[PDB]
A paper describes a structure:
We determined the cryo-EM structure of a mammalian PI31–20S proteasome complex after incubating recombinant human PI31 (hPI31) with the purified latent bovine 20S proteasome featuring a predominately closed-gate conformation. Human and bovine PI31 have 91% sequence identity and function indistinguishably in inhibition assays The maps of PI31-free and PI31-bound proteasome were refined to the resolutions of 2.23 Å and 2.54 Å, respectively. We also examined the difference map between the PI31-bound and PI31-free EM maps and observed hPI31 densities in the 20S antechambers as well as in the catalytic chambers. These findings indicate that the C-terminal regions of PI31 in the catalytic chamber are threaded from the antechambers.
Author numbering:
A (entry chain G): 6 to 246
B (entry chain B): 1 to 233
C (entry chain D): 2 to 244
D (entry chain J): 2 to 205
E (entry chain C): 1 to 251
F (entry chain A): 1 to 245
G (entry chain F): 4 to 241
H (entry chain E): 6 to 241
The structure:
């Protein structure tokens, strides 16, 4: 009875409904997945093409937030872009102050606390996006973190966010990703994305792919065109039985 | 995130001319643990009950009778964390007074400054009034002082008073037991008896906290001294 | 730091806070200004006489400068704020410009202050209307009216406050060049206009007079009573001789 | 140099149950005398006085600001200020201007309210208090005043001996200073009365 | 957010009224009675003591009467802690004027400064108004002895005799009937105050511990402000009782 | 006024109800239970132990990052209960407060002082209307040189206290009654006995036999004041010892 | 309802209603079309006259020598945003002595317009923009929205009745890339004409054309410079 | 009732509520007419005097912004005061910086930039709390010739050949549409303005009920004296 209007108000059950409504905004966006293998992290996004008038790569949901750190988002894209700017600022300030690349766990904690700061006040609105941060280094290994609108940050071996995240998580569970390399994970990621897409509900989609690992010398980058085409062909073949 | 608080008052006048938020803070005070103050001829006693809700609580960890200076003591009835806020503010105000005048703050002056802070919270933007009543004791110019400060910011000077649960009956008991010329030991006995009137269950040296102010200053009674006094009763 | 919008537009195009400030004005005691040839006269009703009140402390007519004075209707404390601001403005104008203000200048300043309070965050409009009279350096008598909205106009004669509609009707039926030919006739016109709404027949009237080059003058009760007796004598003469 | 711009001399002295405070009366600018009745000793209570030497503008400013604060104190607390409390208040006022100091060196002479024990003190321009039991001096001829007071002061003087001692000290000290003098005013504070006198002095 | 929890303290009502000011005036009407009477040789305040309880410690100076500077004093009705705020502001204003001009502040100027503070709370800032009405008594070299009354709205006015607080309207009727302008002395003014307090405090009989009386007079070019002792008020009440008894015997 | 009375906005902002209650603070206390977990802290004669329930529903979640045990300094540990992001913000604040105390005063902050500081910070949320209180509870353990092991708990109301033993979360009432029974029959608690008491309290109120991956244990001892989290091997050794008895 | 007044209030469905209402503000405006070839970017704006005696409202604005915009929605918000974009372009030319790349400018716009969607007492910008630019990456058409989302487009139309224009652009998008400047402008004009009422036709009074290109700084054609582009247009197919 | 929504809330139709309400407020203003010809711009406003005791010369609904620019206002005149002061300051600033006269369009643009600078949060103290309730007609002569611009509280400004604002702006606008042709002379413009004002005014139209001003190439802003007003009105 009027308990769901501000993030500074608790419901009688102990819930903050504004944060839950932001989470609902995330649950309506399209699916992004991240998979952490033994030598890297691979991100795959199902980017829905709403208009054929759009260019390729418009409204991309994969970001480079640092040389070694990539970002996969779901939810309100403008919120996600502002959060990517926040993450870039955090990484750059860390390098300026402490003189080396920010560890992924520290960047995830900093951005998650920034996100949580928007769940306490009536003067602001919780972010309507969740995202994954992926990184690789020789010293720290491969790391994959996920942050939701409430500000909770967790490490994962595989993660899915968006409309079909439960089916995507089920598909991810069937993978022995701990011993796999980035090369075969990219195919597996493309297959999972093609599986969870609904052609009736959504007409067309581009498959955005990126990775970071020893394959890229610890640099997050878009997966090259050859590997992407091979992965798409393999996923399309797996769809047919 | 936005650090701007509300700038409008949360305590406003009702059509009948009352500030209902202050009356509700007083209701919170009236639901608090009983507190008693008695001003004897040579000192003041402040006695409160601290009956923990379990034996798992460490009695010695938290205190309800607090020193403000070497000569001023505090006790409260109401909401404990509000009390901690006011204790910190009172200590800072006493220190600022000492820094300006290089003498310990008179009890009445400190009471006035603390009451001013409480009034500020009755009028300023985006806050509720404090939900505590303070009993303040002090020794100044060879003289004992006992004051009560309410959540509105009004303060009164008392010879003996009670706050918290059953404080009307405590006041009746005090006014039919209190007399002038009383000594500090007899005032301690009377304060413990006033607590005993509203106490539920057995009163032990750990169930209650007692502070005394005399010429030597203000101090909390150790549980051994309280046990001696309880044995005398 | 309180930054609420208090005066906002209503769906019909109205500023309700300004209308409510005008309703606050309509509850004030009546004030009448008449602009004559050589004189400007202000007159204020006293809604009640407490018989124990120091009169000097509750005057509704005050001097903004040597050549400018004003009466008001509405909220007394808002009027005090506005009057003090106008006095500061008059002194600063005497400083930066080596001449006194025209009546229209200080009227413009007061009106713009009121308008600012109708369109700024965290404050309500002033609940007063003002009648400002005076003389310019040319010796021209000037009478102006400001309202809570911030609009101001010039008048030959005007009335504000409660019962101002009947007083304005009377002034429209009565104000004439012949009716302001002498100072006494102008004063009698002001008192007659006030008598259209006041009770007890002239004990509840405070009257002030400004003449060219002369400071503000306040009529003591003896002069007001003498003028009232003159007015009643003229009434009796007209009634008997014409009927 | 700045402290000597207007000249001036103030002195306080302790008696058995009494205090004395004396000041020169000249107001002048460098070598030129302007007036001969400039007030340097201000009452801060029934039995409490403060004398100010230094820049005349800062003498007046500090006296007025101290009166501000003292009036507020005595309204908030329904009592008269004690001399030690007044000294602390003056020191706080002076130290608030630690880097922009007032150019005055106050001297405080009084009796304890309700006790009537003599109190004298002096403060430097940034408010470092110095309580003594015999005498305090301030101004442009402190060396001469020290000679006179160290020679002439005795413990437990009755008010008449105290008046003679402080008078001779002030007169002979300011006779030997170019920019002080043109008359001396002495206040003797006892518990039951205050005596104000002007001394016959050289006017050159 | 702010908008839905904002009480809107400083806005007009549809009738042109300020509701918070009116409710503060209701609060004033609740509080203890204060009375002010001006005579030819002084002025007096007489306030009903609402802190009456046997366990209350004796008050230091006075419960409701505050000295403001060397020449002025005031009495308060309404919210007590708001009155503490206001009396501190008044003392500060008087000392600021003294610092600026090296003369005591005239009474009306002090009242006007405080009333400007009150009005500012009525117009902007979104805060609730002060729930205090004040009576001021003073002397200055311009107008001699003066009595003033100020409201939470910031309105003020000067009076020969006035009353605020509980039963103030009946007290004002008594004052209108009984006050004699230009002929009051402090003795007759004190007698009138005792009679008015007798009528206004209808439930509780006049005893010296239920009332506080302060007089402001001039002696040797100094202003003397004194709260009467308990025995003096007892004598005044005894004299009033004798007057009433003899007036009954005549009738 | 009447029981459970409400007037105005007392159910939405931290203002007093007619009975003098703050409903938003009570709702924050319910927000603690929204997390669904339970933690227990027990004080020994030479040690303090915190044992929290660890739940990882899915294998996709990196378990090493799912912790409610944190170290505030080298010598102070904490277990958080309730909303996870609120808990982590409070942990960050506690670490900052401890570091600043060491910097300003030149010695490590005592546990009671840190608990009191956090409690003051949260009382501020109970008194200001524009922000909600945090929906989390903090339990701190440490070793004071003068007084031995220390267990302190602070809650959303701003209330804090020292405990001989305490619990937080869903089943904290049952846990408190169990600990009351254990502390009434007072016997000298060694390190092993303290750990077993905490673990058996959690296992008996949750009505499940534990596994080394299902719980998290942190300890401070007088011999080794540094806060340390037991590995799964040490926890399994303790669990075996508890199961055989 | 209780969820549709503040931009900081999430609805129970995961939507923000004030943002959607600002989208409606954009949809109320008159149509405008933007398209690009390999070498040119063209904005064609259908201007509306309030009265018969009023000039048609300006729809195409200069931002920089290589960037221009066409606006739909609240004109004053569009002027705010245009001033911001001009200041960014001048900052880039001052600091780096190079023209600001178009996609970086669009990112700055998105960042600036996202902020008021999260802060209490703020509102979204009620303006949609078509941004035509040319830089090292060639020609660019961008679309910015009140939601602060932006799109890189082959072609786009916004404003009232823009769906018909979008259908025409869908049909001839394959042709656009190899068109010469006149043919590209004519494609844009036909798309804009598809949004017109039956009685109304494209005239030199209600058509404005902005062109940017490889060797062509951004140029606006309003009344008489439009006639060479209007000449040669076949009658509406119907 | 009026504090439920903030001042910067969009309606479901994409309009700011406060701007729409200010637009509605302008329909309560007196009628003003601007006509732009090749020989100059004419502006005419109904004064709408309420009482015989009011001095009509104290009503200023037409003001000089600069020697070459005049402004007619409708709606809430007190609101128009600050906008006009801003326009005067901007013209003088432009003269100070560039040693030339500001064009009518740039002055109108500068004034229109203020229309939507209102809000409650994220504002300096004393910032505008609501939109202005005025509609303005700027008539000027610049290098582009004589121009007439209309500005409304939404902040939209448009060039106009002829326009009416105020209470009777619809019927007056329809009359303007039949009367106005491009080659109209300034005398014909003035006569047609006065004819339409006479048609729509509730009172009879004399030399004291109206204000009329013209700006011409080579002649400064000129407010018609009452003798000139009677010269024009004598044959209507």
């Amino acid at each position: 009875t009027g308990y769901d209007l501000s993030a500074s108000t608790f419901s009688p059950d102990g819930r903050v409904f504004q944060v839950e409504y932001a989470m609902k905004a995330v649950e309506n966006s399209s699916t992004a997945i991240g998979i952490r293998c033994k030598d890297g992290v691979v991100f795959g996004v199902e980017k829905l093409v709403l208009s054929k008038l759009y260019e390729e790569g418009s409204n991309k949901r994969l970001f480079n937030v640092d040389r070694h750190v990539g970002m996969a988002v779901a939810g309100l894209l403008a919120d996600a872009r502002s959060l990517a700017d926040i993450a870039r600022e955090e990484a750059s300030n860390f390098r300026s102050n402490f003189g080396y690349n920010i560890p992924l766990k520290h960047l995830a904690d900093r951005v998650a606390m920034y996100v949580h700061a928007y769940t306490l006040y009536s003067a602001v609105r919780p972010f309507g996006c969740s995202f994954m941060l992926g990184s690789y280094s020789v010293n720290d290994g491969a790391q994959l973190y996920m942050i939701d609108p409430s500000g909770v940050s967790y490490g994962y071996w595989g993660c899915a966010i968006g409309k079909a995240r439960q089916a995507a998580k089920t598909e991810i569970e069937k993978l022995q990703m701990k011993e796999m390399t980035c090369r075969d994970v990219v195919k597996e990621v493309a297959k999972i994305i093609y599986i969870v897409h609904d052609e009736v509900k959504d007409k067309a989609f581009e498959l955005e792919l990126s990775w970071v690992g020893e394959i890229t010398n610890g640099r997050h980058e878009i997966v090259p065109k050859d590997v992407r085409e091979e992965a798409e062909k393999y996923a399309k073949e797996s769809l047919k039985e | 995130m936005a650090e701007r608080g509300y700038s409008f008052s949360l305590t406003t006048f009702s059509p009948s001319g009352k500030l209902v938020q202050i009356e509700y803070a007083l209701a919170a005070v009236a639901g608090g643990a009983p507190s008693v103050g008695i001003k004897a001829a040579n000192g003041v006693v402040l006695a409160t009950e601290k009956k923990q809700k379990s034996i798992l609580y460490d009695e010695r960890s938290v205190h309800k009778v607090e020193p403000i200076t070497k000569h001023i003591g505090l006790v409260y009835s109401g909401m404990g964390p509000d009390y901690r806020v006011l204790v910190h503010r009172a200590r800072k105000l006493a220190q600022q007074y000492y820094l300006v005048y290089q003498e310990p703050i008179p009890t009445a002056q400190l009471v006035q400054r603390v009451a001013s802070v409480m009034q500020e919270y009755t009028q300023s933007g985006g806050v509720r009034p404090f939900g505590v009543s303070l009993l303040i004791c002090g020794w100044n110019e060879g003289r004992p002082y006992l004051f009560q400060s309410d959540p509105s910011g009004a303060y009164f000077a008392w010879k003996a008073t009670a706050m918290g649960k059953n404080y009307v009956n405590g006041k009746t008991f005090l006014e039919k037991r209190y007399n002038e010329d009383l000594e500090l030991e007899d005032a301690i006995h009377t304060a413990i008896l006033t607590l005993k009137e509203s106490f539920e269950g057995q009163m032990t040296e750990d169930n209650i906290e007692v502070g005394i102010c005399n010429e030597a200053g203000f101090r909390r009674l150790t549980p051994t001294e309280v046990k001696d006094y309880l044995a005398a009763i | 730091s309180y930054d609420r919008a208090i005066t906002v537009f209503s769906p019909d195009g109205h500023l309700f806070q300004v209308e409510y400030a005008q309703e606050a004005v309509k509850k004030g005691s009546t004030a009448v200004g008449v602009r004559g040839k050589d004189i400007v006269v202000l007159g204020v009703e006293k809604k009640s006489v407490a018989k124990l009140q120091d009169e000097r402390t509750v005057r509704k007519i005050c001097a903004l400068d040597d050549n400018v004075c004003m009466a008001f209707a509405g909220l007394t404390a808002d009027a005090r704020i506005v009057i003090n601001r106008a006095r500061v403005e008059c002194q600063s104008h005497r400083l930066t410009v080596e001449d006194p203000v025209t009546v229209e200048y200080i009227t413009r300043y007061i009106a713009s202050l009121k308008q600012r309070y109708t369109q700024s965050n965290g404050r309500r409009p002033f609940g007063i209307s003002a009648l400002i009279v005076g003389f310019d350096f040319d010796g021209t008598p000037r009478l102006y009216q400001t309202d809570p909205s911030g609009t101001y106009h010039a008048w030959k004669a005007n009335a504000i406050g409660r019962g101002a509609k009947s007083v304005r009707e009377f002034l429209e039926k009565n104000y004439t060049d012949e009716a302001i030919e002498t100072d006494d006739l102008t004063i009698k016109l002001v008192i007659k206009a006030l008598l259209e709404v006041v009770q007890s027949g002239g004990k509840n009237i405070e009257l002030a007079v400004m003449r060219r080059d002369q400071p503000l003058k306040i009529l003591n009760p003896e002069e007001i009573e003498k003028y009232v007796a003159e007015i009643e004598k003229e009434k009796e003469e007209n009634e008997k001789k014409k009927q | 140099s700045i402290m000597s711009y207007n000249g001036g001399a103030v002195m306080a002295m302790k008696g058995k149950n009494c205090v004395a405070i004396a000041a020169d009366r000249r107001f002048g600018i460098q070598a030129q005398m302007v007036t001969t009745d400039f007030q340097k000793i201000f009452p801060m209570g029934d039995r409490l006085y403060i004398g100010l030497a230094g820049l005349a503008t800062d003498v007046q400013t500090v006296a007025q600001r101290l009166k501000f604060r003292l009036n507020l104190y005595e309204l908030k607390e329904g009592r008269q200020i004690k001399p030690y409390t007044l000294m602390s208040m003056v020191a706080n006022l002076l130290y608030e201007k630690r880097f922009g100091p007032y150019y005055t060196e106050p001297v405080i002479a009084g009796l304890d309210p309700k006790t009537f024990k003599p109190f004298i003190c002096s403060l430097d321009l940034i408010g470092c208090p110095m309580v003594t039991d015999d005498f305090v001096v301030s101004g442009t001829c402190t060396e001469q005043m020290y000679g006179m007071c160290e020679s002439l002061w005795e413990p437990n003087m009755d008010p008449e001996h105290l008046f003679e001692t402080i008078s001779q000290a002030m007169l002979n000290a300011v006779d030997r200073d170019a920019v002080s003098g043109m008359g001396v005013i002495v206040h003797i504070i006892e518990k039951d009365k205050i005596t104000t006198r002007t001394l016959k002095a050289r006017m050159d | 957010m702010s908008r839905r929890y904002d009480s809107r303290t400083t806005i007009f009502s549809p009738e042109g009224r300020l509701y918070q000011v009116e409710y503060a005036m209701e609060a004033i009407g609740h509080a203890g009675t204060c009375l002010g009477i001006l005579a030819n040789d002084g002025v007096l305040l007489a306030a009903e003591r609402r802190n009456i309880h046997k366990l209350l410690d004796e008050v230091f100076f006075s419960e409701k009467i505050y000295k403001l500077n060397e020449d002025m004093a005031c009495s308060v009705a309404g919210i007590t802690s708001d009155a503490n705020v206001l009396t501190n502001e008044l003392r500060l204003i008087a000392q600021r004027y003294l610092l600026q001009y090296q003369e005591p502040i005239p009474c009306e100027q002090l009242v006007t400064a405080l009333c400007d503070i009150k009005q500012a709370y009525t117009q902007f800032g979104g805060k609730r108004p002060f729930g205090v009405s004040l009576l001021y008594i003073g002397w200055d070299k311009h107008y001699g002895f003066q009595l003033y009354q100020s409201d939470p709205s910031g309105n003020y006015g000067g009076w020969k005799a006035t009353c605020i607080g509980n039963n103030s309207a009946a007290a004002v009727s008594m004052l209108k009937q009984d006050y004699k302008e230009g002929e009051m002395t402090l003795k007759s003014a004190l007698a009138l105050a005792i009679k008015v307090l007798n009528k206004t405090m209808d439930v509780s009989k006049l005893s010296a511990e239920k009332v506080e009386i302060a007089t402001l007079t001039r002696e040797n070019g100094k202003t003397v402000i004194r709260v009467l002792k308990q025995k003096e008020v007892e004598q005044l009440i005894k004299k009033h009782e004798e007057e009433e008894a003899k007036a009954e015997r005549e009738k | 006024m009447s029981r459970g009375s409400s007037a105005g906005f007392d159910r939405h902002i931290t203002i007093f109800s007619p009975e003098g209650r703050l409903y938003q603070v009570e709702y924050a206390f319910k927000a603690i239970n929204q997390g669904g977990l339970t933690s227990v802290a027990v004080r020994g004669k030479d040690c303090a132990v915190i044992v929290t329930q660890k739940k990882v529903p899915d294998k996709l979640l990196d378990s090493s990052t799912v912790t409610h045990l944190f170290k505030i300094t080298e010598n102070i540990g904490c277990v958080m209960t309730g909303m996870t992001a609120d808990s982590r913000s409070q942990v960050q604040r506690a670490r900052y407060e401890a570091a600043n105390w060491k910097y300003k005063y030149g010695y490590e902050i005592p546990v009671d002082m840190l608990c009191k500081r956090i409690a003051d910070i949260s009382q501020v949320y109970t008194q200001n209307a524009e922000m909600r209180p945090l929906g989390c509870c903090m339990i701190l353990i440490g070793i004071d040189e003068e007084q031995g092991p220390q267990v302190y708990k602070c809650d959303p109301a701003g209330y804090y206290c020292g405990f001989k033993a305490t619990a937080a979360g869903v089943k904290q009432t049952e846990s408190t009654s169990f600990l009351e029974k254990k502390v009434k029959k007072k016997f000298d608690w060694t390190f092993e006995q303290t750990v077993e008491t905490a673990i058996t309290c959690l296992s008996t109120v949750l009505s499940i036999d534990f596994k080394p991956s299902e719980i998290e244990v942190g300890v401070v001892t007088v011999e080794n004041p540094k806060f340390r989290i037991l590995t799964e091997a040490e926890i399994d050794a303790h669990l075996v010892a508890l199961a055989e008895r | 309802n209780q969820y549709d007044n503040d931009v900081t209030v999430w609805s129970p469905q995961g939507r923000i209603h004030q943002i959607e209402y600002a989208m409606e503000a954009v949809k109320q405006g008159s149509a405008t079309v933007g398209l690009k070839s390999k070498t040119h970017a063209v904005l064609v704006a259908l201007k509306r006259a309030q009265s018969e005696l009023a000039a048609h409202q300006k729809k195409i604005l200069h931002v920089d020598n290589h960037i221009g915009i066409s606006i739909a929605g609240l004109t004053a918000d569009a002027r705010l945003l245009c001033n911001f974009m001009r200041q960014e372009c001048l900052d880039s030319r001052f600091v780096f002595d190079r023209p600001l790349p178009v996609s970086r400018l669009v990112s700055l716009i998105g960042s600036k317009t996202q902020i008021p969607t999260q802060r209490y007492g703020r509102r979204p910008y009620g303006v949609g923009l078509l941004i035509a630019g040319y830089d090292d990456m060639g020609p660019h058409i961008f679309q910015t929205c009140p939601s602060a989302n932006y799109f890189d487009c082959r072609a786009m139309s916004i404003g009232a009745r823009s769906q018909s224009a979008r259908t025409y652009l869908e049909r001839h998008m394959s042709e656009f890339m190899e068109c010469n400047l006149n043919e590209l402008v004519k494609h844009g004009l036909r798309a804009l004409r598809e949004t017109l009422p039956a009685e109304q036709d494209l005239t030199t009074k209600n058509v404005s054309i902005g062109i940017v290109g490889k060797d062509l700084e951004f140029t606006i054609y309003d009344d008489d410079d439009v006639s060479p582009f209007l000449e040669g247009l076949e009658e509406r197919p119907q | 009732s009026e504090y439920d929504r903030g001042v910067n809330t969009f309606s479901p139709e994409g309009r700011l509520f406060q701007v729409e309400y200010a637009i509605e407020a302008i329909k309560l203003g007196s009628t003003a007419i601007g006509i732009q010809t090749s020989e100059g711009v004419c502006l005419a406003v109904e004064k709408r005097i309420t009482s015989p005791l009011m001095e009509p010369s104290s009503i200023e609904k037409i003001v000089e912004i600069d020697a070459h620019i005049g402004c007619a206002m409708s709606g809430l005149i007190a609101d128009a005061k600050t906008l006009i002061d801003k326009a005067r300051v901007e013209t003088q600033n432009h003269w100070f910086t560039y040693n030339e006269t500001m064009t009518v369009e740039s002055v109108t643009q500068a004034v229109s930039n203020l229309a939507l600078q209102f809000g409650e949060e994220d504002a300096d103290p004393g910032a505008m709390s609501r939109p202005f309730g005025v509609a303005l007609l700027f008539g000027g002569v610049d290098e582009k010739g004589p121009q007439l611009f209309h500005m409304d509280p939404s902040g939209t400004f448009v060039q106009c050949d002829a326009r009416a604002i105020g209470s009777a702006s619809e019927g007056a606008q329809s009359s303007l549409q039949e009367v106005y042709h491009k080659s109209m002379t300034l005398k014909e413009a003035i006569k047609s303005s006065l004819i339409i004002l006479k048609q729509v005014m509730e009172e009879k139209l004399n030399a004291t009920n109206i204000e009329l001003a013209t700006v011409q190439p080579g002649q400064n802003f000129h407010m018609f004296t009452k003798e000139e007003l009677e010269e024009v009105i004598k044959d209507i």
